[PDB]
Amino acid sequence: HRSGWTAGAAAYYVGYLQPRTFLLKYNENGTITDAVDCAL
Amino acid sequence: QCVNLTTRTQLPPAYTNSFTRGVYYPDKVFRSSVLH
Amino acid sequence: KNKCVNFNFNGLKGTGVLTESNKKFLPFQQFGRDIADTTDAVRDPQTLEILDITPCSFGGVSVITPGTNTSNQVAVLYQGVNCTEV
Amino acid sequence: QKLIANQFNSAIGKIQDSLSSTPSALGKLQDVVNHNAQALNTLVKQLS
Amino acid sequence: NKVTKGLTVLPPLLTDEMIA
Ligand SMILES: *[C@@H]1O[C@H](CO)[C@@H](O)[C@H](O)[C@H]1NC(C)=O
Numbered sequence: 001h002r003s004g005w006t007a008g009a010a011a012y013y014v015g016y017l018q019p020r021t022f023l024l025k026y027n028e029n030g031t032i033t034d035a036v037d038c039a040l
Numbered sequence: 041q042c043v044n045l046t047t048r049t050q051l052p053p054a055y056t057n058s059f060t061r062g063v064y065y066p067d068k069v070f071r072s073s074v075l076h
Numbered sequence: 077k078n079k080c081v082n083f084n085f086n087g088l089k090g091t092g093v094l095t096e097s098n099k100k101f102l103p104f105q106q107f108g109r110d111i112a113d114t115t116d117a118v119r120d121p122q123t124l125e126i127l128d129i130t131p132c133s134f135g136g137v138s139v140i141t142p143g144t145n146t147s148n149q150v151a152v153l154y155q156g157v158n159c160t161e162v
Numbered sequence: 163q164k165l166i167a168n169q170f171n172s173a174i175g176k177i178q179d180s181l182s183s184t185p186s187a188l189g190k191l192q193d194v195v196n197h198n199a200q201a202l203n204t205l206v207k208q209l210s
Numbered sequence: 211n212k213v214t215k216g217l218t219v220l221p222p223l224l225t226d227e228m229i230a
Contacts, residue, residue, distance in 0.1 A: 004047070015058055022063065026071040029100055030108075035063050070101050070108035070117065112206045112215075136218060156218055181212070191213050202217060 080132035085118045090129065097128040133161045 001008060023036040082091050085107065097117050099108065108117035118129050140151040154162055181187055 013056065015062060017062070024063075024066075024076050026074050026076065028073050030070050030072045030102055030105065032063065032065065035060070065104070068104055068106045070099070070105040072099065072108070074111060111203075113210055134216075155220070185212075188212055195213070206215065206217070 077127075083118075083129065086121055088115065088118065090115060092129045092131040095128045095130065097126040099126045099128075101126055133157060 021038045024032055025034040027033045077094050083094055099117050101119050110116040115129055135157045136155040138153040
């Protein structure tokens with residue numbers, strides 16, 4: 001945003017994926033509601 | 041066109057807890073009331 | 077629909093009875109699976125509806141008979157089959 | 163006679179209550195059912 | 211109350227009424 005230039009309130013996160021097995025729980029509609037990390 | 045930016049304030053990267061975020065549907069197969 | 081036919085939903089081989097289903101798929105989800113992880117409900121690619129995909133009737137034919145030393149009459153039992161499906 | 167009859171009646175009532183309350187009293191029949199179900203489920207899962 | 215493909219399950223010869 002130019003007023004030079006000005007930046008508003010913002011923040012973002014960066015996480016990296018890893019290969020691991022999860023236990024996914026599908027509900028009645030078919031929507032994932034919970035998961036378990038088998039190696040936590 | 042591009043402009044060098046030097047008004048940056050140097051700061052080391054921070055860290056925070058991920059909790060239980062980042063889970064996505066692995067595939068398009070529908071499933072209901074199962075544990076997979 | 078409602079006929080024992082070979083169904084093909086985008087290269088999906090199979091044979092069964094295509095009946096309308098009350099399940100609620102998500103927009104990205106194409107075909108469902110049961111507890112056994114087998115094809116159970118498939119959404120038609122052209123018209124968006126939920127259809128069950130059961131396999132055709134099967135069972136076991138048992139034969140009830142007295143000894144051939146007595147008679148040659150037999151009675152046939154179709155295990156686990158409604159009498160309207162034969 | 164009356165004492166014995168009263169004791170028998172009270173004991174049988176307590177039997178009904180104990181069967182109703184404790185969940186693991188019928189573990190053997192439930193184990194039979196679960197074993198059959200899980201054997202069939204494993205055999206089905208082996209197809210994949 | 212307290213007790214709860216190619217594969218078929220056959221019914222028992224004696225119904226629960228007969229056992230009762
Ligand atoms: C679908 O989700 C709603 C909640 O939004 C729930 O009330 C409904 O029971 C679910 N469908 C089935 C078949 O249970």
